[PDB]
Design a protein around this ligand. Structure first.
Ligand SMILES: CCCCCCCCCCCCCC(=O)O
Lengths: 90, 91
């Protein structure tokens, strides 16, 4: 996994992550793809740092949307979406 | 490249990165390895964020030691080592 595919996977989540509402089919599909590429702990740490960068790309980001995405998509997201996560814990 | 490889390659650089002086042979070897695994720009951004994490792992780290590591090792590191870099800016 690489930061560029992570960016690609989360691009359709930008509306939900910045304006709220519901993530939608494309967002959840991208998140599922990314969760599938983040199976091992190494992959998970790399994806976590990539996601931290993507999350920090937007100051308008809503923490409640980021925190509710995994349950709104019905996925056990191994990598949380936050601007302040320390990816060494993953 | 992956964050675990970044951690492993930079582990022998921790003494220089926290107390200064000169990087050991193993440190410079790890840095050259990392320069070699980061061929594409995607690779470079991934390595940059991994390196940001590793750099933030110790606040006792000296940022100037991090900035001087590649030239002290005599290698042009295509990816900068910083605790506060926004990795979207790099090429
Ligand atoms: C000109 C940019 C190409 C299209 C990407 C849109 C950039 C703004 C983000 C708006 C949300 C788009 C989500 C999506 O990719 O479906």
């Amino acid at each position: 996994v690489t930061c560029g595919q992570v960016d690609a996977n989360l691009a359709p989540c930008v509306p939900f992550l910045t304006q709220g509402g519901e993530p939608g089919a494309a967002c959840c599909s991208g998140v599922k793809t990314l969760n599938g590429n983040a199976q091992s702990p190494d992959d998970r740490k790399t994806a976590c740092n990539c996601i931290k960068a993507a999350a920090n790309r937007y100051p308008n980001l809503k923490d409640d949307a980021a925190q509710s995405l995994p349950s709104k998509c019905g996925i056990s997201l191994n990598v949380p979406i936050s601007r302040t996560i320390n990816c060494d814990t993953i």
